[PDB]
Design a protein around this nucleic acid. Structure first.
Lengths: 278, 278
RNA sequence: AAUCUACUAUAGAAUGAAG
RNA sequence: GCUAAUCUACUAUAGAA
Protein backbone atom coordinates (compact mmCIF):
# COMPACT_ATOMS: atom_id res chain seq x y z
CA UNK A 1 0.00 0.00 0.00
CA UNK A 2 1.98 3.00 -1.34
CA UNK A 3 0.86 6.62 -0.76
CA UNK A 4 0.84 9.92 -2.65
CA UNK A 5 1.47 13.23 -0.89
CA UNK A 6 0.13 16.45 -2.39
CA UNK A 7 1.20 19.68 -0.71
CA UNK A 8 -0.08 23.06 -1.84
CA UNK A 9 2.17 25.99 -0.97
CA UNK A 10 1.99 29.74 -0.95
CA UNK A 11 5.28 31.22 -2.07
CA UNK A 12 5.91 34.89 -1.39
CA UNK A 13 9.11 36.64 -2.60
CA UNK A 14 10.47 38.90 0.15
CA UNK A 15 11.87 41.23 -2.53
CA UNK A 16 11.41 42.07 -6.21
CA UNK A 17 12.48 38.93 -8.02
CA UNK A 18 12.87 37.55 -11.53
CA UNK A 19 11.96 33.88 -11.65
CA UNK A 20 14.36 31.14 -12.81
CA UNK A 21 13.64 28.93 -15.83
CA UNK A 22 11.76 26.86 -15.11
CA UNK A 23 9.98 28.24 -12.00
CA UNK A 24 9.92 24.86 -10.23
CA UNK A 25 13.66 25.23 -9.66
CA UNK A 26 13.06 27.55 -6.72
CA UNK A 27 11.13 25.04 -4.68
CA UNK A 28 13.31 22.26 -6.08
CA UNK A 29 16.30 24.10 -4.67
CA UNK A 30 14.76 24.14 -1.20
CA UNK A 31 14.26 20.38 -1.32
CA UNK A 32 17.72 19.88 -2.83
CA UNK A 33 19.35 22.04 -0.17
CA UNK A 34 17.46 19.96 2.39
CA UNK A 35 15.71 23.10 3.66
CA UNK A 36 12.29 21.52 3.27
CA UNK A 37 11.40 17.83 3.08
CA UNK A 38 15.08 16.78 2.87
CA UNK A 39 14.07 13.10 2.65
CA UNK A 40 13.05 13.69 -0.97
CA UNK A 41 16.62 14.44 -1.98
CA UNK A 42 16.97 11.03 -3.64
CA UNK A 43 13.69 11.42 -5.49
CA UNK A 44 14.66 14.89 -6.75
CA UNK A 45 18.07 13.60 -7.85
CA UNK A 46 16.94 10.27 -9.33
CA UNK A 47 17.43 9.83 -13.08
CA UNK A 48 14.95 6.95 -13.04
CA UNK A 49 12.29 6.77 -15.77
CA UNK A 50 8.76 7.94 -14.92
CA UNK A 51 9.72 8.75 -11.33
CA UNK A 52 6.73 9.66 -9.12
CA UNK A 53 7.56 13.26 -8.30
CA UNK A 54 6.00 16.42 -9.65
CA UNK A 55 7.03 19.90 -8.61
CA UNK A 56 4.98 22.53 -10.39
CA UNK A 57 5.82 25.86 -11.96
CA UNK A 58 4.81 28.75 -9.75
CA UNK A 59 1.28 29.88 -10.41
CA UNK A 60 -0.02 33.43 -10.27
CA UNK A 61 -3.75 33.93 -9.99
CA UNK A 62 -5.12 30.52 -11.06
CA UNK A 63 -2.82 29.90 -14.03
CA UNK A 64 0.76 28.63 -14.06
CA UNK A 65 3.21 31.31 -15.09
CA UNK A 66 3.80 30.63 -18.76
CA UNK A 67 7.38 31.41 -19.79
CA UNK A 68 9.17 39.62 -16.18
CA UNK A 69 10.28 40.49 -12.65
CA UNK A 70 7.83 39.80 -9.83
CA UNK A 71 6.97 42.38 -7.19
CA UNK A 72 7.86 42.00 -3.51
CA UNK A 73 4.21 41.65 -2.57
CA UNK A 74 3.11 38.97 -5.02
CA UNK A 75 1.40 35.81 -3.81
CA UNK A 76 2.58 32.86 -5.86
CA UNK A 77 1.25 29.32 -5.63
CA UNK A 78 2.93 25.94 -5.89
CA UNK A 79 2.01 22.28 -5.82
CA UNK A 80 4.20 19.30 -5.07
CA UNK A 81 3.09 15.69 -5.43
CA UNK A 82 5.16 12.58 -4.78
CA UNK A 83 5.35 8.98 -3.63
CA UNK A 84 8.22 7.52 -1.65
CA UNK A 85 8.88 4.50 0.55
CA UNK A 86 10.88 6.82 2.78
CA UNK A 87 9.41 8.02 6.05
CA UNK A 88 8.65 11.62 5.22
CA UNK A 89 5.74 12.11 7.63
CA UNK A 90 7.50 14.38 10.15
CA UNK A 91 8.97 16.55 7.37
CA UNK A 92 5.89 17.29 5.24
CA UNK A 93 4.73 20.20 7.42
CA UNK A 94 8.01 22.03 6.73
CA UNK A 95 7.69 25.77 6.00
CA UNK A 96 9.17 29.15 6.82
CA UNK A 97 11.40 31.93 5.56
CA UNK A 98 14.18 30.84 3.23
CA UNK A 99 17.12 32.29 1.37
CA UNK A 100 17.69 30.96 -2.14
CA UNK A 101 20.02 31.96 -4.96
CA UNK A 102 17.04 33.51 -6.72
CA UNK A 103 16.21 35.54 -3.63
CA UNK A 104 14.40 35.45 -0.31
CA UNK A 105 11.03 33.74 -0.09
CA UNK A 106 8.32 33.15 2.49
CA UNK A 107 6.94 29.64 2.07
CA UNK A 108 3.59 28.95 3.73
CA UNK A 109 1.67 25.69 3.48
CA UNK A 110 -1.85 26.04 2.11
CA UNK A 111 -2.76 22.36 1.96
CA UNK A 112 -1.68 18.78 2.61
CA UNK A 113 -3.45 15.75 1.15
CA UNK A 114 -2.49 12.11 1.59
CA UNK A 115 -3.85 9.53 -0.83
CA UNK A 116 -3.79 5.74 -0.63
CA UNK A 117 -3.50 4.40 -4.18
CA UNK A 118 -5.69 1.40 -3.37
CA UNK A 119 -8.45 3.76 -2.29
CA UNK A 120 -8.14 5.57 -5.63
CA UNK A 121 -9.62 2.46 -7.25
CA UNK A 122 -12.77 3.13 -5.22
CA UNK A 123 -13.14 6.49 -6.96
CA UNK A 124 -12.98 4.90 -10.43
CA UNK A 125 -16.39 3.22 -10.20
CA UNK A 126 -18.30 6.48 -9.70
CA UNK A 127 -16.93 7.72 -13.04
CA UNK A 128 -17.48 4.64 -15.21
CA UNK A 129 -20.35 6.47 -16.95
CA UNK A 130 -18.80 9.90 -17.44
CA UNK A 131 -16.85 11.43 -20.30
CA UNK A 132 -13.23 11.99 -19.37
CA UNK A 133 -11.73 15.43 -19.90
CA UNK A 134 -7.99 15.82 -19.53
CA UNK A 135 -6.87 19.44 -19.24
CA UNK A 136 -3.23 20.41 -19.64
CA UNK A 137 -2.58 23.39 -17.34
CA UNK A 138 1.18 23.32 -17.84
CA UNK A 139 2.86 22.54 -21.18
CA UNK A 140 2.77 18.77 -21.67
CA UNK A 141 5.61 16.90 -23.39
CA UNK A 142 4.48 13.56 -24.84
CA UNK A 143 7.06 11.52 -26.78
CA UNK A 144 5.49 9.68 -29.74
CA UNK A 145 7.94 6.78 -29.42
CA UNK A 146 6.05 5.83 -26.24
CA UNK A 147 3.82 4.00 -28.72
CA UNK A 148 6.73 2.63 -30.77
CA UNK A 149 6.72 -1.16 -31.03
CA UNK A 150 9.40 -2.07 -28.43
CA UNK A 151 11.14 -4.52 -30.78
CA UNK A 152 11.98 -1.51 -32.95
CA UNK A 153 13.57 0.41 -30.05
CA UNK A 154 17.23 -0.21 -31.01
CA UNK A 155 16.47 0.28 -34.71
CA UNK A 156 15.05 3.82 -34.40
CA UNK A 157 17.10 5.03 -31.42
CA UNK A 158 18.63 7.89 -33.41
CA UNK A 159 15.28 9.07 -34.77
CA UNK A 160 14.05 12.19 -32.99
CA UNK A 161 10.30 12.29 -33.43
CA UNK A 162 10.03 14.69 -30.52
CA UNK A 163 6.83 15.58 -28.73
CA UNK A 164 3.32 15.13 -30.07
CA UNK A 165 1.63 18.52 -30.09
CA UNK A 166 -1.46 16.51 -30.96
CA UNK A 167 -1.85 13.90 -28.21
CA UNK A 168 -3.86 10.77 -28.88
CA UNK A 169 -5.82 9.11 -26.08
CA UNK A 170 -3.58 6.04 -26.30
CA UNK A 171 -0.47 8.14 -25.75
CA UNK A 172 -2.00 9.84 -22.69
CA UNK A 173 -3.13 6.62 -21.01
CA UNK A 174 0.09 4.79 -21.91
CA UNK A 175 2.08 7.53 -20.21
CA UNK A 176 -0.17 7.44 -17.15
CA UNK A 177 0.25 3.66 -17.17
CA UNK A 178 4.03 3.98 -17.15
CA UNK A 179 4.06 6.40 -14.22
CA UNK A 180 1.49 4.26 -12.38
CA UNK A 181 3.53 1.09 -12.88
CA UNK A 182 6.71 2.71 -11.63
CA UNK A 183 4.66 3.99 -8.69
CA UNK A 184 3.71 0.51 -7.46
CA UNK A 185 7.05 -1.16 -8.21
CA UNK A 186 5.82 -3.02 -11.29
CA UNK A 187 8.68 -3.54 -13.75
CA UNK A 188 9.14 -4.47 -17.45
CA UNK A 189 5.86 -3.16 -18.86
CA UNK A 190 7.02 -1.82 -22.24
CA UNK A 191 4.92 -4.26 -24.24
CA UNK A 192 1.90 -3.88 -21.96
CA UNK A 193 2.01 -0.09 -22.18
CA UNK A 194 2.37 -0.25 -25.97
CA UNK A 195 -0.55 -2.65 -26.44
CA UNK A 196 -2.62 -0.61 -23.99
CA UNK A 197 -2.08 2.64 -25.86
CA UNK A 198 -2.63 1.12 -29.29
CA UNK A 199 -5.87 -0.56 -28.20
CA UNK A 200 -6.93 2.65 -26.45
CA UNK A 201 -6.62 4.91 -29.49
CA UNK A 202 -8.15 2.18 -31.64
CA UNK A 203 -11.24 1.96 -29.40
CA UNK A 204 -11.63 5.36 -27.73
CA UNK A 205 -13.98 8.00 -29.11
CA UNK A 206 -12.95 11.64 -28.96
CA UNK A 207 -15.94 13.79 -28.04
CA UNK A 208 -14.36 17.23 -28.21
CA UNK A 209 -11.12 19.20 -27.85
CA UNK A 210 -9.38 22.56 -27.71
CA UNK A 211 -5.71 21.83 -28.26
CA UNK A 212 -2.87 24.10 -29.26
CA UNK A 213 0.91 23.71 -29.68
CA UNK A 214 3.00 25.68 -27.23
CA UNK A 215 6.67 26.66 -27.24
CA UNK A 216 8.19 26.08 -23.82
CA UNK A 217 11.36 27.31 -22.15
CA UNK A 218 13.82 25.34 -20.04
CA UNK A 219 17.10 26.50 -18.46
CA UNK A 220 20.66 27.16 -19.56
CA UNK A 221 24.62 23.88 -18.83
CA UNK A 222 27.58 25.90 -20.18
CA UNK A 223 25.45 28.47 -21.99
CA UNK A 224 23.15 26.02 -23.74
CA UNK A 225 19.57 27.27 -23.40
CA UNK A 226 16.68 24.84 -23.60
CA UNK A 227 13.46 25.13 -25.57
CA UNK A 228 10.84 22.64 -26.71
CA UNK A 229 7.37 22.18 -28.14
CA UNK A 230 4.48 20.71 -26.21
CA UNK A 231 0.72 21.01 -26.03
CA UNK A 232 -1.79 22.88 -23.89
CA UNK A 233 -5.57 22.98 -23.89
CA UNK A 234 -7.96 20.11 -23.17
CA UNK A 235 -9.41 16.94 -24.70
CA UNK A 236 -12.63 15.06 -23.94
CA UNK A 237 -13.07 11.41 -24.83
CA UNK A 238 -14.76 8.16 -23.80
CA UNK A 239 -13.78 4.50 -24.00
CA UNK A 240 -16.59 2.07 -24.93
CA UNK A 241 -14.74 -0.91 -23.44
CA UNK A 242 -15.33 -1.37 -19.71
CA UNK A 243 -12.05 -3.01 -18.70
CA UNK A 244 -10.05 -0.49 -20.69
CA UNK A 245 -11.99 2.42 -19.22
CA UNK A 246 -11.50 1.17 -15.67
CA UNK A 247 -7.75 0.86 -16.17
CA UNK A 248 -7.47 4.22 -17.93
CA UNK A 249 -9.46 5.89 -15.16
CA UNK A 250 -7.12 4.33 -12.60
CA UNK A 251 -3.92 5.56 -14.25
CA UNK A 252 -5.37 8.99 -15.00
CA UNK A 253 -6.51 9.33 -11.39
CA UNK A 254 -2.88 8.81 -10.40
CA UNK A 255 -1.84 11.30 -13.10
CA UNK A 256 -4.10 13.99 -11.59
CA UNK A 257 -1.55 14.06 -8.78
CA UNK A 258 1.74 13.11 -10.43
CA UNK A 259 1.33 14.83 -13.80
CA UNK A 260 1.67 13.35 -17.27
CA UNK A 261 4.28 12.96 -19.98
CA UNK A 262 7.96 13.77 -19.78
CA UNK A 263 9.82 15.95 -17.24
CA UNK A 264 7.07 16.08 -14.61
CA UNK A 265 9.81 16.45 -12.02
CA UNK A 266 10.29 20.06 -13.08
CA UNK A 267 6.63 20.96 -13.67
CA UNK A 268 5.55 19.84 -17.12
CA UNK A 269 2.42 17.78 -17.75
CA UNK A 270 0.35 19.22 -14.94
CA UNK A 271 -3.23 18.17 -15.62
CA UNK A 272 -6.70 18.58 -14.21
CA UNK A 273 -8.99 15.61 -14.61
CA UNK A 274 -12.67 16.28 -15.13
CA UNK A 275 -15.74 14.21 -15.78
CA UNK A 276 -19.16 14.84 -17.26
CA UNK A 277 -22.35 12.81 -16.96
CA UNK A 278 -23.81 11.47 -20.20
CA UNK B 1 -1.40 0.28 -65.69
CA UNK B 2 -4.21 1.78 -63.63
CA UNK B 3 -5.25 5.38 -64.26
CA UNK B 4 -7.07 8.07 -62.32
CA UNK B 5 -9.55 10.34 -64.05
CA UNK B 6 -10.27 13.66 -62.39
CA UNK B 7 -13.00 15.73 -64.01
CA UNK B 8 -13.95 19.18 -62.76
CA UNK B 9 -17.49 20.23 -63.56
CA UNK B 10 -19.39 23.47 -63.52
CA UNK B 11 -23.01 22.81 -62.56
CA UNK B 12 -25.75 25.37 -63.15
CA UNK B 13 -29.32 24.60 -62.04
CA UNK B 14 -31.78 25.81 -64.68
CA UNK B 15 -34.29 26.75 -61.99
CA UNK B 16 -34.47 27.70 -58.32
CA UNK B 17 -33.59 24.44 -56.55
CA UNK B 18 -33.35 22.85 -53.14
CA UNK B 19 -30.43 20.43 -52.78
CA UNK B 20 -30.55 16.76 -51.66
CA UNK B 21 -28.53 15.42 -48.73
CA UNK B 22 -25.85 14.75 -49.58
CA UNK B 23 -25.42 17.09 -52.57
CA UNK B 24 -23.17 14.63 -54.45
CA UNK B 25 -26.39 12.67 -55.03
CA UNK B 26 -27.32 14.98 -57.87
CA UNK B 27 -24.31 14.18 -59.98
CA UNK B 28 -24.47 10.64 -58.67
CA UNK B 29 -27.96 10.27 -60.09
CA UNK B 30 -26.72 11.20 -63.54
CA UNK B 31 -24.10 8.43 -63.56
CA UNK B 32 -26.71 5.96 -62.38
CA UNK B 33 -29.11 7.13 -65.05
CA UNK B 34 -26.27 6.66 -67.53
CA UNK B 35 -26.97 10.18 -68.72
CA UNK B 36 -23.26 10.89 -68.22
CA UNK B 37 -20.42 8.35 -68.09
CA UNK B 38 -22.71 5.27 -67.87
CA UNK B 39 -19.81 2.80 -67.66
CA UNK B 40 -19.11 3.76 -64.06
CA UNK B 41 -22.42 2.34 -62.84
CA UNK B 42 -20.63 -0.77 -61.56
CA UNK B 43 -18.12 1.31 -59.62
CA UNK B 44 -20.94 3.44 -58.22
CA UNK B 45 -22.88 0.32 -57.26
CA UNK B 46 -19.80 -1.48 -55.94
CA UNK B 47 -19.77 -2.31 -52.24
CA UNK B 48 -16.06 -3.11 -52.22
CA UNK B 49 -13.95 -1.73 -49.40
CA UNK B 50 -11.89 1.34 -50.31
CA UNK B 51 -13.15 1.42 -53.92
CA UNK B 52 -11.40 4.07 -56.03
CA UNK B 53 -14.23 6.50 -56.66
CA UNK B 54 -14.95 9.95 -55.26
CA UNK B 55 -17.79 12.24 -56.29
CA UNK B 56 -17.66 15.50 -54.37
CA UNK B 57 -20.30 17.60 -52.75
CA UNK B 58 -21.30 20.73 -54.51
CA UNK B 59 -19.62 23.03 -54.76
CA UNK B 60 -19.60 26.83 -54.59
CA UNK B 61 -16.75 29.28 -54.02
CA UNK B 62 -13.61 27.09 -53.42
CA UNK B 63 -15.59 25.60 -50.42
CA UNK B 64 -18.03 22.67 -50.36
CA UNK B 65 -21.62 23.26 -49.24
CA UNK B 66 -21.92 22.30 -45.58
CA UNK B 67 -25.14 20.33 -45.14
CA UNK B 68 -31.59 26.05 -47.49
CA UNK B 69 -32.37 26.73 -51.11
CA UNK B 70 -30.01 27.90 -53.87
CA UNK B 71 -30.97 30.27 -56.70
CA UNK B 72 -31.43 29.45 -60.42
CA UNK B 73 -28.49 31.57 -61.49
CA UNK B 74 -25.90 30.02 -59.17
CA UNK B 75 -22.71 28.53 -60.53
CA UNK B 76 -21.92 25.42 -58.55
CA UNK B 77 -18.81 23.26 -58.79
CA UNK B 78 -18.26 19.54 -58.62
CA UNK B 79 -15.32 17.18 -58.95
CA UNK B 80 -15.16 13.47 -59.79
CA UNK B 81 -12.20 11.14 -59.44
CA UNK B 82 -12.11 7.43 -60.28
CA UNK B 83 -10.10 4.43 -61.44
CA UNK B 84 -11.37 1.54 -63.57
CA UNK B 85 -9.81 -0.89 -66.06
CA UNK B 86 -12.79 -0.45 -68.38
CA UNK B 87 -12.46 1.93 -71.32
CA UNK B 88 -14.35 5.09 -70.49
CA UNK B 89 -12.14 7.51 -72.46
CA UNK B 90 -14.89 8.31 -74.96
CA UNK B 91 -17.44 8.90 -72.17
CA UNK B 92 -15.54 11.37 -69.95
CA UNK B 93 -16.37 14.48 -71.99
CA UNK B 94 -20.13 14.00 -71.50
CA UNK B 95 -22.05 17.15 -70.60
CA UNK B 96 -25.23 19.13 -71.32
CA UNK B 97 -28.69 19.82 -69.92
CA UNK B 98 -30.21 17.07 -67.80
CA UNK B 99 -33.45 16.28 -65.99
CA UNK B 100 -33.20 15.11 -62.39
CA UNK B 101 -35.74 14.60 -59.60
CA UNK B 102 -33.93 17.47 -57.88
CA UNK B 103 -34.42 19.64 -60.97
CA UNK B 104 -33.08 20.68 -64.36
CA UNK B 105 -29.33 21.18 -64.51
CA UNK B 106 -26.67 22.39 -66.93
CA UNK B 107 -23.48 20.37 -66.60
CA UNK B 108 -20.42 21.83 -68.32
CA UNK B 109 -16.88 20.52 -67.98
CA UNK B 110 -14.25 22.92 -66.67
CA UNK B 111 -11.40 20.44 -66.38
CA UNK B 112 -10.05 16.96 -67.14
CA UNK B 113 -6.86 15.35 -65.80
CA UNK B 114 -5.58 11.85 -66.48
CA UNK B 115 -2.98 10.36 -64.17
CA UNK B 116 -0.86 7.27 -64.63
CA UNK B 117 -0.30 6.06 -61.07
CA UNK B 118 3.17 4.67 -61.79
CA UNK B 119 4.18 8.22 -62.77
CA UNK B 120 3.16 9.59 -59.36
CA UNK B 121 6.39 8.27 -57.82
CA UNK B 122 8.10 10.91 -59.95
CA UNK B 123 6.39 13.60 -57.89
CA UNK B 124 7.39 11.85 -54.65
CA UNK B 125 11.09 12.56 -54.96
CA UNK B 126 10.31 16.24 -55.55
CA UNK B 127 8.82 16.48 -52.05
CA UNK B 128 11.12 14.26 -49.97
CA UNK B 129 12.47 17.37 -48.22
CA UNK B 130 9.21 19.23 -47.67
CA UNK B 131 6.74 19.36 -44.79
CA UNK B 132 3.36 17.83 -45.61
CA UNK B 133 0.03 19.58 -45.06
CA UNK B 134 -3.15 17.58 -45.38
CA UNK B 135 -6.24 19.76 -45.57
CA UNK B 136 -9.69 18.24 -45.26
CA UNK B 137 -11.97 20.35 -47.46
CA UNK B 138 -14.97 18.10 -46.95
CA UNK B 139 -15.89 16.41 -43.66
CA UNK B 140 -13.57 13.43 -43.32
CA UNK B 141 -14.68 10.16 -41.73
CA UNK B 142 -11.70 8.19 -40.38
CA UNK B 143 -12.53 5.02 -38.47
CA UNK B 144 -10.20 4.61 -35.50
CA UNK B 145 -10.39 0.84 -35.87
CA UNK B 146 -8.25 1.15 -39.02
CA UNK B 147 -5.43 1.00 -36.48
CA UNK B 148 -6.95 -1.87 -34.49
CA UNK B 149 -4.71 -4.94 -34.32
CA UNK B 150 -6.34 -7.12 -37.02
CA UNK B 151 -6.30 -10.24 -34.82
CA UNK B 152 -8.60 -8.41 -32.39
CA UNK B 153 -11.27 -7.53 -35.01
CA UNK B 154 -13.55 -10.40 -34.06
CA UNK B 155 -13.30 -9.71 -30.35
CA UNK B 156 -14.24 -6.02 -30.49
CA UNK B 157 -16.63 -6.26 -33.47
CA UNK B 158 -19.60 -5.03 -31.44
CA UNK B 159 -17.63 -1.98 -30.31
CA UNK B 160 -18.48 1.18 -32.22
CA UNK B 161 -15.50 3.46 -31.67
CA UNK B 162 -16.57 5.65 -34.57
CA UNK B 163 -14.58 8.36 -36.32
CA UNK B 164 -11.49 10.06 -34.97
CA UNK B 165 -12.28 13.76 -34.65
CA UNK B 166 -8.58 14.15 -33.87
CA UNK B 167 -6.81 12.15 -36.59
CA UNK B 168 -3.32 10.80 -36.06
CA UNK B 169 -0.85 10.80 -38.96
CA UNK B 170 -0.67 7.01 -38.82
CA UNK B 171 -4.43 6.73 -39.30
CA UNK B 172 -4.36 9.04 -42.33
CA UNK B 173 -1.44 7.28 -44.05
CA UNK B 174 -2.91 3.86 -43.19
CA UNK B 175 -6.16 4.84 -44.89
CA UNK B 176 -4.23 6.16 -47.86
CA UNK B 177 -2.33 2.85 -47.84
CA UNK B 178 -5.56 0.81 -47.89
CA UNK B 179 -7.08 2.82 -50.75
CA UNK B 180 -3.78 2.65 -52.64
CA UNK B 181 -3.45 -1.11 -52.16
CA UNK B 182 -7.01 -1.70 -53.35
CA UNK B 183 -6.20 0.57 -56.29
CA UNK B 184 -3.33 -1.53 -57.66
CA UNK B 185 -4.97 -4.85 -56.82
CA UNK B 186 -2.69 -5.72 -53.92
CA UNK B 187 -5.06 -7.55 -51.62
CA UNK B 188 -5.38 -8.50 -47.95
CA UNK B 189 -2.87 -6.06 -46.42
CA UNK B 190 -4.48 -5.47 -43.00
CA UNK B 191 -1.36 -6.35 -40.99
CA UNK B 192 1.00 -4.24 -43.13
CA UNK B 193 -1.42 -1.32 -43.07
CA UNK B 194 -1.74 -1.55 -39.27
CA UNK B 195 2.01 -1.75 -38.73
CA UNK B 196 2.52 1.09 -41.19
CA UNK B 197 0.17 3.39 -39.31
CA UNK B 198 1.50 2.46 -35.87
CA UNK B 199 5.09 3.04 -36.92
CA UNK B 200 4.10 6.21 -38.75
CA UNK B 201 2.49 8.01 -35.83
CA UNK B 202 5.21 6.65 -33.59
CA UNK B 203 7.85 8.33 -35.77
CA UNK B 204 6.20 11.33 -37.43
CA UNK B 205 6.54 14.87 -36.07
CA UNK B 206 3.45 17.07 -36.05
CA UNK B 207 4.46 20.63 -36.95
CA UNK B 208 1.08 22.31 -36.67
CA UNK B 209 -2.68 21.91 -36.95
CA UNK B 210 -6.06 23.60 -36.98
CA UNK B 211 -8.55 20.79 -36.56
CA UNK B 212 -12.20 20.91 -35.55
CA UNK B 213 -14.88 18.24 -35.12
CA UNK B 214 -17.82 18.76 -37.46
CA UNK B 215 -21.28 17.21 -37.35
CA UNK B 216 -22.33 16.01 -40.78
CA UNK B 217 -25.65 15.07 -42.35
CA UNK B 218 -26.23 12.22 -44.79
CA UNK B 219 -29.41 11.24 -46.60
CA UNK B 220 -32.63 9.54 -45.70
CA UNK B 221 -33.82 6.01 -46.46
CA UNK B 222 -37.31 4.49 -46.72
CA UNK B 223 -37.51 7.79 -43.27
CA UNK B 224 -34.43 7.18 -41.14
CA UNK B 225 -32.04 10.14 -41.28
CA UNK B 226 -28.27 9.72 -41.18
CA UNK B 227 -25.76 11.77 -39.22
CA UNK B 228 -22.16 11.41 -38.11
CA UNK B 229 -19.13 13.17 -36.68
CA UNK B 230 -15.95 13.83 -38.60
CA UNK B 231 -13.11 16.31 -38.80
CA UNK B 232 -12.28 19.33 -40.92
CA UNK B 233 -9.32 21.68 -40.93
CA UNK B 234 -5.68 20.96 -41.67
CA UNK B 235 -2.60 19.26 -40.24
CA UNK B 236 1.09 19.73 -41.02
CA UNK B 237 3.66 17.06 -40.25
CA UNK B 238 7.01 15.54 -41.22
CA UNK B 239 8.47 12.02 -41.13
CA UNK B 240 12.15 11.73 -40.10
CA UNK B 241 12.44 8.31 -41.77
CA UNK B 242 13.12 8.37 -45.52
CA UNK B 243 11.47 5.07 -46.53
CA UNK B 244 8.31 5.78 -44.54
CA UNK B 245 8.14 9.29 -45.97
CA UNK B 246 8.48 7.92 -49.50
CA UNK B 247 5.64 5.44 -49.05
CA UNK B 248 3.44 7.98 -47.26
CA UNK B 249 4.02 10.53 -50.01
CA UNK B 250 2.98 7.97 -52.63
CA UNK B 251 -0.24 6.96 -50.87
CA UNK B 252 -1.19 10.56 -50.04
CA UNK B 253 -0.55 11.51 -53.66
CA UNK B 254 -3.19 8.95 -54.64
CA UNK B 255 -5.55 10.17 -51.90
CA UNK B 256 -5.37 13.75 -53.24
CA UNK B 257 -7.41 12.36 -56.13
CA UNK B 258 -9.45 9.61 -54.51
CA UNK B 259 -10.07 11.18 -51.12
CA UNK B 260 -9.48 9.76 -47.65
CA UNK B 261 -11.47 7.99 -44.96
CA UNK B 262 -14.94 6.48 -45.19
CA UNK B 263 -17.66 7.16 -47.78
CA UNK B 264 -15.50 8.93 -50.38
CA UNK B 265 -18.01 7.73 -52.97
CA UNK B 266 -20.50 10.35 -51.77
CA UNK B 267 -18.09 13.24 -51.26
CA UNK B 268 -16.36 12.73 -47.92
CA UNK B 269 -12.65 12.91 -47.21
CA UNK B 270 -11.79 15.34 -49.97
CA UNK B 271 -8.28 16.57 -49.26
CA UNK B 272 -5.76 18.99 -50.66
CA UNK B 273 -2.13 18.08 -50.22
CA UNK B 274 0.22 21.03 -49.78
CA UNK B 275 3.93 21.26 -49.18
CA UNK B 276 6.45 23.56 -47.53
CA UNK B 277 10.18 24.01 -47.96
CA UNK B 278 12.11 22.86 -44.87
C1' A C 1 9.88 23.70 -35.87
C1' A C 2 12.22 21.91 -31.12
C1' U C 3 17.48 21.12 -26.21
C1' C C 4 21.08 20.18 -23.10
C1' U C 5 23.13 15.45 -20.54
C1' A C 6 27.43 10.64 -17.66
C1' C C 7 22.08 6.63 -22.89
C1' U C 8 17.55 4.69 -17.69
C1' A C 9 17.02 8.63 -23.82
C1' U C 10 9.89 6.00 -25.10
C1' A C 11 14.38 9.07 -19.82
C1' G C 12 16.15 12.91 -16.61
C1' A C 13 17.10 17.87 -16.41
C1' A C 14 22.00 23.05 -12.01
C1' U C 15 24.88 18.70 -6.76
C1' G C 16 25.81 20.83 -0.61
C1' A C 17 29.96 13.70 -0.86
C1' A C 18 30.50 22.42 0.02
C1' G C 19 37.29 18.45 3.10
C1' G D 1 -17.94 31.65 -28.57
C1' C D 2 -18.82 26.32 -29.19
C1' U D 3 -17.68 20.15 -28.58
C1' A D 4 -21.90 12.67 -28.58
C1' A D 5 -23.06 10.23 -33.97
C1' U D 6 -26.62 6.59 -38.63
C1' C D 7 -29.54 3.78 -41.66
C1' U D 8 -28.51 -0.88 -44.52
C1' A D 9 -28.30 -7.15 -47.78
C1' C D 10 -22.01 -7.79 -43.21
C1' U D 11 -16.82 -6.84 -47.55
C1' A D 12 -19.07 -3.18 -41.36
C1' U D 13 -11.62 -1.09 -40.08
C1' A D 14 -17.37 -1.09 -45.39
C1' G D 15 -21.16 1.11 -48.27
C1' A D 16 -24.80 4.62 -48.31
C1' A D 17 -32.30 4.92 -52.03
Amino acid sequence: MPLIFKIGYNVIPLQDVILPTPSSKVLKYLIQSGKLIPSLKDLITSRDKYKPIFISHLGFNQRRIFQKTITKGSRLSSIIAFSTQANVLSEVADEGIFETVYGKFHIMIESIEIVEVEKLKEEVEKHMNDNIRVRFVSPTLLSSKVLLPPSLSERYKKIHAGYSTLPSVGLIVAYAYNVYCNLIGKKEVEVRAFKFGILSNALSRIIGYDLHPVTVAIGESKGNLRKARGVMGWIEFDIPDERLKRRALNYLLTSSYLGIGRSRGIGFGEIRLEFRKI
